[PDB]
Each structure stands twice: as structure tokens, then as C-alpha cells.
Backbone:
């Protein structure tokens, strides 16, 4: 689709069989999701947001559908204010910014 | 232009007579710029995300040139680690997300 920006670009994602709402976020390098259960091992990551740095859990090679598009990649789990789809997965779905 | 998302979508802006580099950020409702002086009245606001909140000064009716396109709107000024062009100005330059 072509998504204008008068409203927040919220989409439905599917991860671990569950539907969640998430924000398409070109200002995020990484995809960050609220606390949930994911399979496999995780590794630590420090990410720096508007308010400072936080620790999150990094899960790699996670299957995730974004607005109906299949992606497989890194998902960070931690205390984010909203689920954000960052550029690591926006690139997988072929998203560009245009003006 | 069409901007791919392999790297941060950084553009040059002009604000208050100064050139700065800023992120085109679909995940931000509003535009947030590092500390600088702007003309006119302002009021304080708290904005929050990953890592918590920061206090900013809200200036209304500020003109920015974003990658050569002029737009006017509210600009928040404070200790953000990155300059952020949010939806309030992305709409004005006709920016869309496409996939
Ligand atoms: C969290 C999101 C819903 C909202 N933000 C935009 C988001 O795009 C940030 C933009 C940003 C980019 C670099 C550094 C700091 C901030 N990205 C981000 O945190 O990305 C993380 C995930 O990947 C990592 O890569 C980049 C950092 C890491 S915000 O900045 O917190 C933000 C922007 C505007 C407003 C508010 C909060 C608010 O409350 O009112 B407001 O005036 O509307
Ligand atoms: Cl840890
Ligand atoms: Cl990835
Ligand atoms: Cl505005
Ligand atoms: Na003003």
C-alpha cells in the first residue's frame, strides 16, 4: 500500500501466532516489541532511545508477519511504549519513503 | 525522491537559519530538534519513548526546509540524541511509506 502520515502508521503484525498492533517506524533501527514469550536463546542488547539507554532481549531469526508480509529477523523484547517495526524488518517488506 | 531504508533516512534541514541533519521518522508524531534558539513564545512539554521522558520547549508556527521542501508547524526543542522530523511535518512535504 501507500501509507500517508496524517495518522500513526499502525498495522497488525502476527508473531508467535498472536496478533498485535505495531507502528511502522522509519526512525527505529531495530524492531522492539512489548514483553512476550519467544522461542530459543536470546542475547543482550543496549538500545538508546529518546530518554536514554535500556536493556532488551535480542531474539534472532523470528518469523513475523507485518501487514500481511512475511519477514524473518531480529526482534528485541523490552519496555518499549509501543510495538515498533524498525528498519531491519521494513527493508524485508520492501518499504520505502517517498516524497 | 524514493528513500530506501537500508540506512537511517537522514536529510539536511534548515531551521532558524541553521543547517542540521535530521531523521525522517514515521514513528514520531511530532518534530524534535536538539538544543537551539528559536523565535517566539514557547511552552514546556514532556515527551517519552525508549529510555523514558525528556523535557522540551514547544514552539509553534516554525518554518523548516526539509530536503529542499518548505513546511511550517510545531517544533519541540530539547536534549534529543537525534534530530527527528515527525509526521506533523512529513505530511506537509507529502511523504508516504510504500511497500
Ligand atoms: C518510540 C517511538 C514510538 C517514538 N519515538 C520515535 C522513534 O522513531 C525513535 C526516534 C529516535 C531515534 C534515535 C534516537 C532516539 C530516538 N526511535 C527509537 O527509539 O528507535 C529505537 C529502536 O531502534 C533504535 O534505533 C534508533 C533508536 C532505537 S520517540 O523519539 O521516542 C518520540 C518522538 C516524538 C514524540 C514522542 C516520542 C512523544 O512522546 O511526543 B512526541 O513529541 O510526539
Ligand atoms: Cl542482560
Ligand atoms: Cl534482522
Ligand atoms: Cl504542527
Ligand atoms: Na511561534
Residues:
Amino acid at each position: 500500500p501507500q501509507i500517508t502520515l496524517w495518522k500513526r502508521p499502525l498495522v497488525t503484525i502476527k508473531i508467535g501466532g498472536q496478533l498485535k498492533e505495531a507502528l511502522l517506524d522509519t526512525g527505529a533501527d531495530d524492531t522492539v516489541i512489548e514483553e512476550m514469550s519467544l522461542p530459543g536463546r536470546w542475547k543482550p542488547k543496549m538500545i538508546g532511545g529518546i530518554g536514554g539507554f535500556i536493556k532488551v532481549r535480542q531474539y534472532d531469526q523470528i518469523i513475523i508477519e507485518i501487514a500481511g508480509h512475511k519477514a524473518i529477523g531480529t526482534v528485541l523484547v523490552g519496555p518499549t511504549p509501543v510495538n515498533i517495526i524498525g528498519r531491519n524488518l521494513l527493508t524485508q517488506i520492501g518499504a520505502t519513503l517517498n516524497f
